[PDB]
Amino acid sequence: FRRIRLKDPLKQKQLLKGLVQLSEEGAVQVFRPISNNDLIVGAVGVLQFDVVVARLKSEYNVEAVYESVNVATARWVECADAKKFEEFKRKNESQLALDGGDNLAYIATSMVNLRLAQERYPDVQFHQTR
Amino acid sequence: DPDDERNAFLEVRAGTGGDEAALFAGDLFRMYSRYAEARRWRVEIMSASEGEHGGYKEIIAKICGDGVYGRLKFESGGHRVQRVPATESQGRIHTSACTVAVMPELPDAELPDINPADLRIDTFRSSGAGAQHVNTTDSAIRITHLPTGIVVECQDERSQHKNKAKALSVLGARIHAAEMAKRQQAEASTRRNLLGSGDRSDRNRTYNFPQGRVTDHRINLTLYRLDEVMEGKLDMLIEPIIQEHQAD
Amino acid sequence: ATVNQLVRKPRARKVAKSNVPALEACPQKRGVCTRVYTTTPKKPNSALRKVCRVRLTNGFEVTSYIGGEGHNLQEHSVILIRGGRVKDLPGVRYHTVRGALDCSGVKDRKQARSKYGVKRPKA
RNA sequence: CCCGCAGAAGAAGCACCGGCUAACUCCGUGCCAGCAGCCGCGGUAAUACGGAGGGUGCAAGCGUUAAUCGGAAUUACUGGG
RNA sequence: AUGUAAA
């Protein structure tokens, strides 16, 4: 789904910790792009009102009202073996994004980019981690 | 677009440096007049104020016709003055600045109708003093607007219908005042957008006379002609800015 | 001289004030950072110096200079403020830390990248 | 702590380069963009902005910021008028 | 009487 845009932008550390605290769950996985804004909320379901209600706790005080921003399909998680992912980072370093648990799959925008990722041949023992 | 076909108001004002600056501003009147006579535009000597050695402190004018505004819209901003001027006994190169605002027509559609339904008038006797007649019959005809919420009160005198005429004249005067105040704040905001602080900061156009060239910041040109601009014939400064403005 | 007057009134060392009133000697502060605009400097400079009036977290209203080429500030985006005068703006004695909180680093810089928060070129 | 095995194989960055203070050129703008601890450069042939090459210094640390002292004999009793 | 504002 859509985003984190940090309404009332003072004290950002409660969502930089507390939603990454919720990122280990199977339903909620918070994804971090490199540009340090616009953090992605990853839900397997549709109703993200659960996290919005969960943002009203003792260490949770940010509202983050939702809108429509398109991110297409689930960021298929894959991390390559050594002596191969270094050039993969160096070619398109503006096209990475940290994940829940310090992962870097490619970036989720479209099926054509996933076809280019399959054409890129990341030969590795595959770990789903989902 | 009909906005491109509209007339314009040119406001050429002096910035840093006084007269050296005033002379530069004055030439620009000559620049756009030689630019304007190459096409057949009407120059209006609507407003001017003189300088010590020639050139002007603030000049405001109308140019009418068919399609003055786009150029004016593009121009609004600062102009550098790099020169060896006439008002100097040392013979050095000095910088001054001027500011040019380009305003559109905005034709005056004034005096909307009073509208009887929208405003409700209340007939009350009124306050005041001294007559048997003063108490019994009403003389407060308050007019209350529906869309703005303004009440006019001319609990004024003798009877309530001359007070109605007085209260409608006050409604018309307050509508005219509240609309012309917003327009002078809407002109003022536009005026501010057209002209910055007036200093020597670079705003989209320069003039380098001991070098023979003119730089433009947005869609800049390497034309050292300055001469062509000096007696009209600029086209080459204004046209490519329009060419890469129509791309956006 | 006149050591008996030094006996009466002791010789007092001058307590010089700090160049940054930063609430009991802090390196950095983090403020609300409103009012982003350009300022004409003092005499021999002539530039459009990007500055911001930073409402700090301790109540002080300081104004810090925005360095670098390009920024993403509009009346919001709380950032980090460091000390040090600028000698260019009367009233500005602070700088903005790039690479810190929500203001990102300067785009496409290679040299002097410890300052202005630019990471190493990975290629 | 000692012995054996694989393969130089897994392990180098940060600041500065006008003077103070250790180190040079070229290109892009041109008192716009910008740097700066002080004097300060940039107004079209910049050893001072940005990029490239090169060098200098420090080293798993390097620059910035913040506090104390020295230089400050600018709190002088040593040690001022 | 004045005489701006670039070594």
Side-chain angles (χ1 to χ4, degrees):
Chain A
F1 305 90
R2 193 184 171 269
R3 283 297 182 268
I4 296 167
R5 290 184 66 187
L6 295 172
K7 288 184 179 181
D8 291 331
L10 295 174
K11 298 294 187 290
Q12 294 178 356
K13 299 298 294 295
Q14 279 78 16
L15 297 185
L16 292 175
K17 291 182 181 179
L19 291 177
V20 179
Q21 285 179 356
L22 294 174
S23 66
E24 293 179 354
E25 297 178 355
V28 178
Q29 291 179 356
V30 174
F31 295 101
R32 291 182 179 178
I34 299 172
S35 66
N36 290 318
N37 290 318
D38 288 330
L39 299 175
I40 299 170
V41 175
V44 179
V46 176
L47 295 173
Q48 286 185 353
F49 293 100
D50 301 331
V51 184
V52 177
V53 173
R55 287 183 180 95
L56 294 175
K57 293 181 182 180
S58 65
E59 60 183 1
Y60 291 98
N61 290 318
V62 181
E63 294 179 353
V65 180
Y66 288 164
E67 287 293 327
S68 66
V69 174
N70 292 318
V71 174
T73 61
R75 193 174 291 178
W76 183 262
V77 177
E78 186 176 3
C79 295
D81 286 331
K83 204 178 179 181
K84 291 179 182 178
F85 71 99
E86 293 179 353
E87 293 180 353
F88 288 162
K89 290 183 179 180
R90 287 179 181 175
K91 289 186 288 293
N92 54 6
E93 70 271 15
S94 67
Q95 201 176 2
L96 276 73
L98 293 172
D99 300 335
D102 292 330
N103 290 318
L104 295 166
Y106 179 73
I107 266 179
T109 54
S110 66
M111 190 66 202
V112 179
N113 290 318
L114 192 146
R115 184 176 291 171
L116 294 174
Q118 291 180 355
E119 190 179 1
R120 201 174 188 180
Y121 292 105
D123 48 352
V124 65
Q125 183 178 2
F126 184 75
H127 294 284
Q128 183 62 255
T129 66
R130 290 186 183 274
Chain B
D1 291 331
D3 292 331
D4 292 331
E5 293 179 353
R6 291 181 180 178
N7 301 318
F9 293 91
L10 290 181
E11 295 179 353
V12 179
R13 301 290 296 272
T16 61
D19 190 2
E20 179 61 356
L23 264 54
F24 196 88
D27 296 355
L28 287 177
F29 182 90
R30 293 179 181 176
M31 283 287 289
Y32 294 111
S33 69
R34 291 178 180 176
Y35 201 90
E37 290 178 353
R39 292 184 176 182
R40 293 179 181 177
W41 296 85
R42 301 171 56 91
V43 176
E44 303 178 2
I45 303 181
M46 306 306 301
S47 61
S49 66
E50 301 180 3
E52 299 181 0
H53 300 265
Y56 304 91
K57 297 184 178 181
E58 60 179 357
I59 300 182
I60 303 180
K62 295 181 182 181
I63 293 174
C64 294
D66 288 329
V68 184
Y69 188 31
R71 323 297 175 85
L72 300 179
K73 276 186 171 180
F74 279 120
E75 294 186 358
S76 65
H79 299 284
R80 287 189 184 178
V81 178
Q82 297 179 349
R83 285 182 181 176
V84 183
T87 298
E88 185 181 3
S89 66
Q90 293 180 356
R92 293 179 182 177
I93 299 169
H94 291 268
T95 60
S96 70
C98 292
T99 59
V100 172
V102 179
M103 294 299 291
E105 289 179 353
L106 294 175
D108 48 354
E110 74 270 13
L111 203 279
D113 290 332
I114 304 180
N115 301 1
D118 304 4
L119 60 178
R120 302 179 181 180
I121 305 179
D122 296 353
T123 60
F124 60 89
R125 46 187 175 182
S126 67
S127 66
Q132 272 197 63
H133 183 268
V134 177
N135 302 11
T136 63
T137 62
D138 54 354
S139 180
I141 316 100
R142 299 178 299 181
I143 303 179
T144 61
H145 284 288
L146 289 174
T148 61
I150 307 179
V151 178
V152 178
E153 300 180 355
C154 292
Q155 296 177 358
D156 197 2
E157 46 66 23
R158 185 58 55 37
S159 61
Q160 55 69 23
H161 286 290
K162 293 180 181 180
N163 291 320
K164 282 183 179 179
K166 180 61 60 180
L168 289 171
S169 66
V170 172
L171 290 176
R174 287 181 180 177
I175 286 170
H176 182 74
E179 289 179 353
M180 290 300 291
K182 290 182 181 179
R183 289 179 181 176
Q184 289 179 356
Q185 287 179 355
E187 289 178 353
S189 61
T190 59
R191 297 183 178 181
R192 277 208 165 189
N193 295 0
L194 295 178
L195 299 178
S197 67
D199 291 330
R200 294 179 181 177
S201 65
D202 279 334
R203 292 166 182 164
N204 291 320
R205 284 184 182 178
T206 66
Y207 291 100
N208 297 320
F209 289 94
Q211 300 296 0
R213 58 64 178 270
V214 172
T215 69
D216 291 332
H217 295 283
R218 48 190 174 178
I219 306 180
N220 38 312
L221 290 185
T222 60
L223 303 176
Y224 304 90
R225 302 178 181 179
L226 304 175
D227 303 2
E228 303 177 4
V229 179
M230 275 306 301
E231 293 179 353
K233 303 178 181 179
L234 305 178
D235 293 331
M236 295 298 291
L237 293 173
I238 298 170
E239 286 179 353
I241 298 171
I242 301 170
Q243 287 179 356
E244 290 191 359
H245 181 74
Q246 291 179 356
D248 290 331
Chain C
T2 315
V3 71
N4 196 0
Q5 291 179 357
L6 294 172
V7 171
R8 290 185 181 91
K9 181 174 72 68
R11 178 67 68 191
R13 179 65 178 86
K14 184 188 286 185
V15 179
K17 68 180 179 67
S18 178
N19 289 318
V20 282
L23 193 67
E24 295 177 354
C26 71
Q28 283 76 239
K29 282 291 184 182
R30 184 180 60 83
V32 180
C33 188
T34 61
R35 196 65 179 87
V36 177
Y37 66 98
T38 62
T39 304
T40 61
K42 67 185 290 183
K43 187 183 288 185
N45 298 115
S46 180
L48 287 81
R49 300 299 180 96
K50 277 80 177 175
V51 79
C52 56
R53 292 180 65 249
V54 178
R55 174 69 69 191
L56 291 175
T57 186
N58 55 3
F60 290 100
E61 180 66 28
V62 302
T63 173
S64 66
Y65 175 74
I66 297 170
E69 292 180 354
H71 61 88
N72 53 5
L73 278 74
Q74 44 181 354
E75 296 178 354
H76 292 285
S77 70
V78 171
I79 60 168
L80 188 66
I81 304 300
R82 67 179 176 90
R85 65 180 293 165
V86 297
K87 199 178 67 68
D88 192 73
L89 283 78
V92 172
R93 295 187 298 273
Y94 292 97
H95 290 88
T96 61
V97 178
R98 308 290 296 273
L101 278 75
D102 291 331
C103 180
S104 66
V106 182
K107 182 175 73 174
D108 291 331
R109 295 292 299 273
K110 300 293 183 182
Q111 293 179 356
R113 61 185 178 271
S114 291
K115 293 186 286 185
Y116 298 100
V118 179
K119 294 181 176 67
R120 178 172 172 85
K122 191 175 177 67

